[PDB]
Design a protein around this motif. Structure first.
Motif, PDB file in Angstrom:
ATOM      1  N   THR A 117      29.666 -12.006  -8.560  1.00 58.43           N
ATOM      2  CA  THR A 117      28.666 -10.837  -8.174  1.00 58.43           C
ATOM      3  C   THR A 117      27.268 -11.349  -8.528  1.00 58.43           C
ATOM      4  N   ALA A 118      27.026 -12.161  -9.810  1.00 56.47           N
ATOM      5  CA  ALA A 118      25.907 -12.333 -10.476  1.00 56.47           C
ATOM      6  C   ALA A 118      25.317 -13.514  -9.295  1.00 56.47           C
ATOM      7  N   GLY A 119      26.149 -14.407  -8.832  1.00 52.35           N
ATOM      8  CA  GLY A 119      25.599 -15.365  -7.743  1.00 52.35           C
ATOM      9  C   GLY A 119      25.022 -16.630  -8.497  1.00 52.35           C
ATOM     10  N   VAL A 120      25.365 -16.992  -9.682  1.00 53.44           N
ATOM     11  CA  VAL A 120      25.102 -17.811 -10.340  1.00 53.44           C
ATOM     12  C   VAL A 120      25.579 -19.376 -10.212  1.00 53.44           C
ATOM     13  N   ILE A 121      24.813 -20.257 -10.463  1.00 52.17           N
ATOM     14  CA  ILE A 121      25.363 -21.695 -10.340  1.00 52.17           C
ATOM     15  C   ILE A 121      25.816 -22.231 -11.775  1.00 52.17           C
ATOM     16  N   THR A 122      25.083 -21.805 -13.060  1.00 46.74           N
ATOM     17  CA  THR A 122      25.513 -22.301 -14.375  1.00 46.74           C
ATOM     18  C   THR A 122      25.616 -20.837 -15.113  1.00 46.74           C
ATOM     19  N   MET A 123      26.349 -21.183 -16.409  1.00 48.68           N
ATOM     20  CA  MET A 123      26.973 -20.056 -17.105  1.00 48.68           C
ATOM     21  C   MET A 123      25.256 -19.713 -18.090  1.00 48.68           C
ATOM     22  N   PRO A 124      24.671 -20.674 -18.538  1.00 45.76           N
ATOM     23  CA  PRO A 124      23.304 -20.337 -19.018  1.00 45.76           C
ATOM     24  C   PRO A 124      22.716 -19.544 -18.154  1.00 45.76           C
ATOM     25  N   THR A 126      42.863 -17.679 -29.313  1.00 47.12           N
ATOM     26  CA  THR A 126      42.329 -16.601 -28.088  1.00 47.12           C
ATOM     27  C   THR A 126      40.569 -16.726 -28.103  1.00 47.12           C
ATOM     28  N   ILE A 127      40.053 -16.692 -29.299  1.00 47.00           N
ATOM     29  CA  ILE A 127      38.640 -16.703 -29.567  1.00 47.00           C
ATOM     30  C   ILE A 127      37.979 -18.193 -28.926  1.00 47.00           C
ATOM     31  N   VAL A 128      38.493 -19.278 -29.364  1.00 46.17           N
ATOM     32  CA  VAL A 128      38.106 -20.517 -28.902  1.00 46.17           C
ATOM     33  C   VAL A 128      38.671 -20.814 -27.541  1.00 46.17           C
ATOM     34  N   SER A 129      39.625 -20.622 -27.196  1.00 43.30           N
ATOM     35  CA  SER A 129      40.125 -20.832 -25.844  1.00 43.30           C
ATOM     36  C   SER A 129      39.151 -19.800 -24.753  1.00 43.30           C
ATOM     37  N   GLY A 130      38.699 -18.602 -25.416  1.00 42.96           N
ATOM     38  CA  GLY A 130      37.865 -17.897 -24.571  1.00 42.96           C
ATOM     39  C   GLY A 130      36.657 -18.462 -24.283  1.00 42.96           C
ATOM     40  N   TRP A 131      35.980 -19.166 -25.072  1.00 42.18           N
ATOM     41  CA  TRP A 131      35.018 -20.157 -24.746  1.00 42.18           C
ATOM     42  C   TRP A 131      35.189 -21.134 -23.758  1.00 42.18           C
ATOM     43  N   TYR A 132      36.223 -21.892 -24.064  1.00 38.91           N
ATOM     44  CA  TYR A 132      36.979 -22.969 -23.467  1.00 38.91           C
ATOM     45  C   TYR A 132      37.198 -22.461 -21.914  1.00 38.91           C
ATOM     46  N   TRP A 133      37.790 -21.593 -21.723  1.00 37.82           N
ATOM     47  CA  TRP A 133      38.111 -21.283 -20.276  1.00 37.82           C
ATOM     48  C   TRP A 133      37.253 -20.168 -19.582  1.00 37.82           C
ATOM     49  N   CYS A 134      36.700 -19.344 -20.394  1.00 32.51           N
ATOM     50  CA  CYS A 134      36.079 -18.146 -19.731  1.00 32.51           C
ATOM     51  C   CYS A 134      34.493 -18.442 -19.859  1.00 32.51           C
ATOM     52  N   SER A 135      33.928 -18.872 -20.762  1.00 32.35           N
ATOM     53  CA  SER A 135      32.474 -19.182 -20.755  1.00 32.35           C
ATOM     54  C   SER A 135      31.684 -20.425 -20.834  1.00 32.35           C
ATOM     55  N   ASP A 136      32.565 -21.445 -20.204  1.00 33.74           N
ATOM     56  CA  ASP A 136      32.185 -22.850 -20.408  1.00 33.74           C
ATOM     57  C   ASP A 136      32.109 -23.359 -18.923  1.00 33.74           C
ATOM     58  N   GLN A 137      30.939 -24.241 -18.707  1.00 41.06           N
ATOM     59  CA  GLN A 137      30.394 -24.819 -17.333  1.00 41.06           C
ATOM     60  C   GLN A 137      31.837 -25.475 -16.788  1.00 41.06           C
ATOM     61  N   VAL A 138      32.387 -26.356 -17.525  1.00 38.24           N
ATOM     62  CA  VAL A 138      33.308 -27.348 -16.882  1.00 38.24           C
ATOM     63  C   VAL A 138      34.583 -26.466 -16.521  1.00 38.24           C
ATOM     64  N   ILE A 139      35.272 -25.294 -16.939  1.00 39.44           N
ATOM     65  CA  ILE A 139      36.301 -24.570 -16.141  1.00 39.44           C
ATOM     66  C   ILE A 139      35.642 -23.727 -15.229  1.00 39.44           C
ATOM     67  N   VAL A 140      34.631 -23.178 -15.712  1.00 40.28           N
ATOM     68  CA  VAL A 140      34.078 -22.002 -14.707  1.00 40.28           C
ATOM     69  C   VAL A 140      33.515 -22.600 -13.478  1.00 40.28           C
ATOM     70  N   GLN A 141      32.860 -23.747 -13.477  1.00 41.05           N
ATOM     71  CA  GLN A 141      32.686 -24.435 -11.993  1.00 41.05           C
ATOM     72  C   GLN A 141      33.601 -24.647 -11.043  1.00 41.05           C
ATOM     73  N   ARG A 142      34.846 -24.510 -11.316  1.00 37.52           N
ATOM     74  CA  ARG A 142      35.967 -24.502 -10.347  1.00 37.52           C
ATOM     75  C   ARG A 142      36.254 -23.224  -9.697  1.00 37.52           C
ATOM     76  N   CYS A 143      35.939 -22.040 -10.594  1.00 33.79           N
ATOM     77  CA  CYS A 143      35.824 -20.853 -10.129  1.00 33.79           C
ATOM     78  C   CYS A 143      34.722 -20.297  -9.370  1.00 33.79           C
ATOM     79  N   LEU A 144      33.421 -20.919  -9.558  1.00 31.95           N
ATOM     80  CA  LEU A 144      32.278 -20.826  -8.858  1.00 31.95           C
ATOM     81  C   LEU A 144      32.337 -21.309  -7.467  1.00 31.95           C
ATOM     82  N   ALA A 145      33.416 -22.257  -7.116  1.00 33.12           N
ATOM     83  CA  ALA A 145      33.467 -22.887  -5.873  1.00 33.12           C
ATOM     84  C   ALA A 145      34.633 -22.592  -5.079  1.00 33.12           C
ATOM     85  N   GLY A 146      35.203 -21.327  -5.341  1.00 31.50           N
ATOM     86  CA  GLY A 146      36.480 -20.723  -4.675  1.00 31.50           C
ATOM     87  C   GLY A 146      36.096 -20.111  -3.371  1.00 31.50           C
ATOM     88  N   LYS A 147      37.056 -19.819  -2.302  1.00 35.08           N
ATOM     89  CA  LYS A 147      36.724 -19.295  -1.199  1.00 35.08           C
ATOM     90  C   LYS A 147      36.505 -17.916  -1.466  1.00 35.08           C
TER      91      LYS A 147
END
Ligand SMILES: Cc1ccc([C@@H]2O[C@H](CO)[C@@H](O)[C@H](O)[C@H]2O)cc1Cc1ccc(-c2ccc(F)cc2)s1
Ligand SMILES: CC(=O)N[C@@H]1[C@@H](O)[C@H](O)[C@@H](CO)O[C@H]1O
Ligand code: NA
Lengths: 29, 586
Positions: free
Chosen positions: B99-106, B264-285
């Motif tokens: 909903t934010a329409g972001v390309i990057t997490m920064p 859970t805290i360090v996995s939270g950064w890795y999976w929820c907050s980080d460009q590498v994983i979240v780019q796969r979710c920003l290119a969803g249908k």
């Protein structure tokens, strides 16, 4: 027994998710 | 050298070239949307396959089997923690990022808080975290497997790998890598399953693993060197809690409270907050597709126990005098490393157990793992650099120059990683897996604390969020400094690091660092003036369904109510399967 640890784990998880529905159903609406 | 290995490598390369060329024929790579975000066109099965493939590297085979060999089955904790955290991506974080329409997490933090400076800090910190925690493990683990399985030069081979993964990355955009990651995920799981099968046949099944592993010690426990002497019975015997995920909270090598909260805290950064994983979710249908791909990736993230951890324990059972060696002279003879030889666990099974044809397939599995992971890092770092840092130095840029700057960064980060390869070759044995997870635990928790307060507590403002992050790094380097000043050693040769510095497990200090960064963010936020609701529509979890006109400091995430019910049920069933298995091996 490993299988009882499995079933106990699942049981406790289903209690917590049943609580999560209960709380949001009564305290968000 | 047997022709069947060359035909399997040629077959795998022709699949990867073939799917690359089909993706480039299909998708548009002329625009920033297309090349960096796959057109916002990826359905569920590439999203799942790519989340999985972008995570599972050569590190996962070398590190999880090696640590499997060394310490039993609690290392599955790293993989299995992921299962719970992918559900927080699909259901809480992914909706707000769409909903934010972001390309990057920064860029999300720029919209949420609004200074120039939080975006810049998080871009530059993410670049250092990817050189330290993500490239280093893939280059290192690559090098282990080439030295052991092939014997080719581990400098020139890493250059050739970095070279082909460069071209694979720059040629296509996120659409190429996600369709190629559906081929790579097939080969990775398929060949990993074939080796799992051969391994479990050699120990005599699953019963064989669990009745042979606790006995499986080396016969050479006496050094020729005085002031090493008789190696302690504590440090060549396999651990009596080797078969238990959930180990002792003060004396466990991975304490159970540190496993669950701290990962859970360090996995939270890795999976929820980080460009590498979240780019796969920003290119969803659509959010339904993201949630569906998060479930697929979850079921796949169970597989690594049975495919990496348990094979590495079987290598200890089969080759104890080489995989479980403790004497410095013996370990220097076996794999070059005075501190131990755990690392040869996975690549001994490929040399010993695999026949003439399938050795090739297991080379293709390592190649598949390494290329998928290094390409995902080069693409995501390209996005971070181009969108956050280069649009600062050139604001009126335009989508032709930005793609060229994207492609030239991929060249530059390949060359920086070549420059970095000797520093990572300084890591002696399994020191690197442990250090990666330390660094992650000392720099990630402040970021985890900010994205949770950015998403869930609308009172938190830019002064709070920024001085939260910087206070975080001060605390995180107070330990990431002093330790590395002492070194690591082994159980045979302990480091001189003080107990009051090293005795707290790094995943416990993750929990401390998270709550102190959290508390600092909230305190400085609550002192300084707040941000009103007109700045905050579709940027916070409360307001992801707003329709009101935001004032800046397809945004449409509804769902076919029937398909919502489908992905919601499979989330709860996938957690039941998770929870059962945590119980089984607790
Ligand atoms: C090499 C590697 C690199 C990254 C991860 C990811 O770590 C993230 C955390 O920052 C997780 O959230 C992700 O779910 C996970 O997939 C896992 C592994 C596997 C290990 C080998 C060996 C390891 C190891 C060795 C010694 C330890 F003490 C602890 C872990 S860990
Ligand atoms: C280095 C060292 O302690 N050597 C001793 C050795 O003298 C003794 O014969 C042996 C008996 O098991 O135990 C060991
Ligand atoms: Na990978």
């Amino acid at each position: 027994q490993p299988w009882m640890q499995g079933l106990i784990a699942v049981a406790v998880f289903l209690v917590l998710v049943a609580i999560a529905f209960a709380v949001n159903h009564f305290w968000c609406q | 050298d047997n022709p069947a290995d060359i035909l399997v490598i040629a077959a795998y390369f022709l699949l990867v070239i073939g799917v690359g060329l089909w993706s480039m024929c299909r998708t548009n790579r002329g625009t920033v949307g297309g090349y960096f975000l796959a057109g916002r066109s990826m359905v569920w099965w590439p999203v799942g396959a790519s989340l999985f493939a972008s995570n599972i590297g050569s590190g996962h085979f070398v590190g999880l089997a090696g640590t499997g060999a060394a310490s039993g089955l609690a290392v599955a904790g790293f993989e299995w923690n992921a299962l719970f955290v992918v559900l927080l991506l699909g259901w809480l974080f992914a909706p707000v990022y769409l909903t934010a329409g972001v390309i990057t997490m920064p860029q999300y933090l720029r919209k949420r808080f609004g200074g120039r400076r939080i975006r810049l800090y998080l871009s530059v910190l993410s670049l250092f975290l990817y050189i330290f925690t993500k490239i280093s493990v893939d280059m290192f683990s690559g090098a282990v497997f080439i030295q052991q399985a092939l014997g080719w030069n581990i400098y020139a081979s890493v250059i050739a790998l970095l070279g082909i993964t460069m071209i694979y990355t720059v040629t296509g955009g996120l659409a190429a890598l996600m369709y190629t990651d559906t081929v790579q995920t097939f080969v990775i799981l398929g060949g990993a399953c074939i080796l799992m099968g051969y391994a479990f046949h050699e120990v005599g099944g699953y019963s064989g693993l669990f009745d042979k592993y606790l006995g499986a010690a080396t016969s050479l426990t006496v050094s020729e060197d005085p002031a090493v002497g008789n190696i302690s019975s504590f440090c060549y015997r396999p651990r009596p809690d080797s078969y238990h995920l959930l180990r002792h909270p003060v004396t466990g090598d991975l304490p159970w409270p540190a496993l669950l909260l701290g990962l859970t805290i360090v996995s939270g950064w890795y999976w929820c907050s980080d460009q590498v994983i979240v780019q796969r979710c920003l290119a969803g249908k659509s959010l339904t597709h993201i949630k569906a791909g998060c479930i697929l990736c979850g079921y796949l993230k169970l597989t690594p126990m049975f495919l990496m951890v348990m094979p590495g324990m079987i290598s200890r059972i089969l080759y104890p005098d080489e995989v479980a060696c403790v004497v410095p002279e013996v370990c220097r003879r076996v794999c070059g490393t005075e501190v131990g030889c755990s690392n040869i666990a996975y690549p001994r099974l490929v040399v010993k157990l695999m026949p003439n044809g399938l050795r090739g397939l297991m080379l293709a599995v390592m190649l598949a793992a390494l290329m998928s992971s290094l390409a995902s890092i080069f693409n995501s770092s390209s996005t971070l650099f181009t969108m956050d840092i280069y649009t600062r130095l050139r604001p009126r840029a335009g989508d032709r120059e930005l793609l060229l700057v994207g492609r030239l960064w991929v060249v530059f980060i390949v060359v920086v990683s070549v420059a970095w390869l000797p520093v990572v070759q300084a890591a002696q044995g399994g020191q690197l897996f442990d250090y990666i997870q330390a660094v992650s635990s000392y720099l990630a928790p402040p970021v985890s604390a900010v994205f949770v307060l950015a998403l869930f507590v609308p009172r938190v403002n830019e002064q709070g969020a920024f001085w939260g992050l910087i206070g975080g790094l001060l605390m995180g380097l107070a330990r990431l400094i002093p330790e590395f000043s002492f070194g690591s050693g082994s159980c045979v040769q302990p480091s001189a690091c003080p107990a009051f510095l090293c005795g707290v497990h790094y995943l416990y200090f993750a929990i401390v660092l998270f709550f102190c960064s959290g508390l600092l963010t909230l305190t400085v936020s609550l002192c300084t003036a707040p941000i009103p609701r007109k700045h905050l529509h579709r940027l916070v979890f409360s307001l992801r369904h707003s329709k009101e006109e935001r004032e800046d400091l397809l945004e449409d995430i509804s769902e076919d109510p029937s398909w919502a019910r489908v992905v919601n049920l499979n989330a709860l069933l996938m957690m039941a399967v998770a929870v059962f298995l945590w119980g089984f091996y607790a």
